[PDB]
């Protein structure tokens, strides 16, 4: 139908949101939602599992319950999972989290920025960027940027190599922007937008 799609859509939104927000500092990145008939299998993909799953499974069962009451599932029609996504550097969202945490704890600007860009480009990233806007020095805002490697910014091929993320840091005397980009060495399967190459 036209409708079944939109159901799955709005579901996937709300789901995503609630996890992204309330589950912090585990390096949350993605999920996936699928159904096998009469079950629902929702995986969760976050850098650090031991925080997600809880000490003996309290945390994961918690989330399960929450979901069920909202979207009106029965038990045994919903089950959740965790996974480690290792190579933390190659997720926007992961490094956005980490960077946020440091700025909230009264670390500087340039120090924090650099630390990210290190860990990224060691993981094997082609190039990355980081931005911070908002207060710094005092009055009349400011914006600054830190760049390493190289990246594309046009086409639809920067929408299949570069996935970005944006977050806030709430402080006294101002809000403070933050954003992190990160161009991957890989596509979502394979593809290169240009680069003709001769195989002998």
């Amino acid at each position: 139908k036209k409708r079944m799609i939109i159901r799955d859509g709005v579901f996937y939104a709300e789901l995503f949101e609630f996890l992204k927000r309330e589950l912090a500092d585990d390096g949350f990145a993605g999920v996936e939602h699928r159904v096998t008939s009469t079950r629902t299998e929702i995986v969760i993909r976050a850098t650090k599992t031991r925080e997600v799953l809880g000490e003996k499974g309290r945390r994961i069962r918690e989330l399960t319950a929450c979901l069920q009451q909202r979207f009106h599932y029965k038990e045994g029609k919903l089950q959740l999972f965790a996974e480690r996504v290792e190579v933390r550097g190659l997720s926007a969202m992961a490094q956005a989290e980490s960077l946020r945490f440091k700025l909230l704890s009264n670390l500087q600007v340039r120090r924090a920025a650099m630390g990210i860009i290190r860990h990224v480009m060691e993981s094997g990233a082609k190039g990355c960027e980081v931005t911070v806007g908002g207060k710094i020095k005092g009055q009349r805002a400011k914006s600054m940027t830190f760049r390493d490697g190289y990246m594309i910014k046009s086409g639809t091929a920067h929408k299949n190599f570069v996935d970005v993320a944006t977050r806030h840091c709430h402080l006294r005397a101002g809000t403070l922007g933050v954003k992190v980009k990160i161009m991957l060495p890989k596509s979502m399967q394979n593809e290169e937008e240009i680069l003709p190459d001769v195989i002998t």
Partner: protein, 99 residues
């Protein structure tokens, strides 16, 4: 009715795995297949203003979804249908409407 399996999805290269391969079971494998196939793809198109306030030069965006639809036929299998269906469950946001 007759046995009519429909497959709907939000993208191509999802449908093709289900239909065009893994209904193999009913195909030449054990029994007859009458294969019709695929249907008008619909577009769901949501035009939306781009400025969060009132200023600007009156820019917009257009957004789109695609639906994809398929359809295949079998001439009364008597609960071979159990088998044939159940093997591909695969790919998130593909749904299967059996009649």
């Amino acid at each position: 009715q007759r046995v009519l399996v429909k497959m709907t999805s939000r993208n191509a290269k999802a449908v093709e795995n289900v239909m065009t391969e893994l209904l193999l079971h009913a195909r030449n494998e054990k029994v007859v297949l009458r294969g019709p196939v695929r249907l008008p793809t619909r577009t769901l198109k949501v035009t939306t203003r781009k400025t969060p306030c009132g200023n600007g030069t009156n820019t917009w965006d257009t957004y789109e979804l695609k639906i994809y639809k398929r359809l295949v036929e079998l001439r009364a299998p008597t609960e071979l249908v159990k088998k044939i269906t159940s093997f591909p469950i695969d790919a998130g946001v593909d749904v299967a409407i059996t009649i």
